[PDB]
């Protein structure tokens, strides 16, 4: 799964089966990292109009 974003701590109580999370666009918004099983939130990097 490829993508760009800032990986931050999260407070989403994922259930054991649950691995990732999806937004309305179906783009991944949270992910469970392998090897360490922690849940990292994925927030798109800051952008806007110059």
């Amino acid at each position: 799964l490829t993508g760009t974003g800032v990986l931050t701590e999260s407070n989403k109580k994922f259930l054991p089966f649950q691995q990732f999370g999806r937004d309305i666009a179906d783009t991944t918004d949270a992910v469970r990292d392998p090897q360490t099983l922690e849940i990292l939130d994925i927030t798109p990097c800051s952008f806007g109009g110059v």
Partner: protein
């Protein structure tokens, strides 16, 4: 339902935006709706299609 006229405008704008974001999840006949999957899975001659 006193302020329905403003609420209809807000709901229509939010619904149009929501449908616009829902359109990203459709592949439109391609193998996948994600660009990153196509860039990671295929060579440029089929990736351009």
């Amino acid at each position: 339902s006193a302020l329905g006229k403003l609420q209809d405008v807000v709901n229509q704008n939010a619904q149009a935006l929501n449908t616009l974001v829902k359109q990203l999840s459709s592949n439109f006949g391609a193998i996948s709706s994600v660009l990153n999957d196509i860039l990671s899975r295929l060579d440029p001659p089929e990736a351009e299609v």
